[PDB]
Amino acid sequence: GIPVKLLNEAQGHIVSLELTTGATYRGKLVESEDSMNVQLRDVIATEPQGAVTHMDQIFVRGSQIKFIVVPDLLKNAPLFKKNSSRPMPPIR
């Protein structure tokens, strides 16, 4: 699906997270899988009650993610082209 492909297109850019536990992890996205579980680098953390800390590396489970904020300039990214023309696939 497109929503996950946009998350793969956001690698290496600052993103925000909301876990369903209520916390907020904002920082740079290193890895993401098709299970939506991502790992982030040099991230600032906001606990559900507002206490903010800083951690260098984090890995979160995709099932616990609520929304992900992605740099706005990915809006016009080619994933959202409705009528697009692909070439023929290679024969293997």
Partner 1 sequence: VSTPELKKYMDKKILLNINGSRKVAGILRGYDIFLNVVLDDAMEINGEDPANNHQLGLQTVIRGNSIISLEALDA
Partner 2 sequence: KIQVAHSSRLANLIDYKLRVLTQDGRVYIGQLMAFDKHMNLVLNECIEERVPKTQLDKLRPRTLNIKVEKRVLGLTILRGEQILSTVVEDKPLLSKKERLVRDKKEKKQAQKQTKLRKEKEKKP
Partner 3 sequence: TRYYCEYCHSYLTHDTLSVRKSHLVGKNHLRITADYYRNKARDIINKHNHKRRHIGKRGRKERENSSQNETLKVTCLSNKEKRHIMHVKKMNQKELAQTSIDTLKLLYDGSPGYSKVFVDANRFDIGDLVKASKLPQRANSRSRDETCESNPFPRLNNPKKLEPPKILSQWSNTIPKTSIFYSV
Partner RNA sequence: AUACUUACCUUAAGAUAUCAGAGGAAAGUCCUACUGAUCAAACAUGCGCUUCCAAUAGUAGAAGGACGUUAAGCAUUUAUCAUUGAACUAGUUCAUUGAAGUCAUUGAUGCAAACUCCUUGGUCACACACACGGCGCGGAAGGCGUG
Partner RNA sequence: UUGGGGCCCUUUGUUUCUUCUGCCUGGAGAAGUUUGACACCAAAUUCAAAUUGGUGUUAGGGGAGCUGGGGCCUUUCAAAA
Partner RNA sequence: ACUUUGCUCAAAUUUUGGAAGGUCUUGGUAGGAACGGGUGGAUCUUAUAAUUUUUGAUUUAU
Question: What does residue 2 show for φ and ψ, rounded to 5 degrees?
Answer: -65, -45
52 binds RNA (CB under 7 A): yes
The closest of 77, 84, 76, 74 to 13, measured between CA atoms, is 74
Q: How many residues does the chain have?
A: 92
CB of 92 to partner 2, least distance (A): 19
- Based on the shown chain and the rule CB under 8 A, indicate whether residue 55 belongs to the binding site for partner 1: yes
Q: Does 89 bind partner 3 (CB under 8 A)?
A: yes
By CB under 8 A, residue 49 contacts partner 1: no
Q: Is 79 within 8 Å of 4 (Cβ atoms)?
A: no
In the complex, the residues that contact RNA under the rule CB under 7 A are: 4, 20, 35-37, 49-53, 61-63, 86, 88-89, 91-92
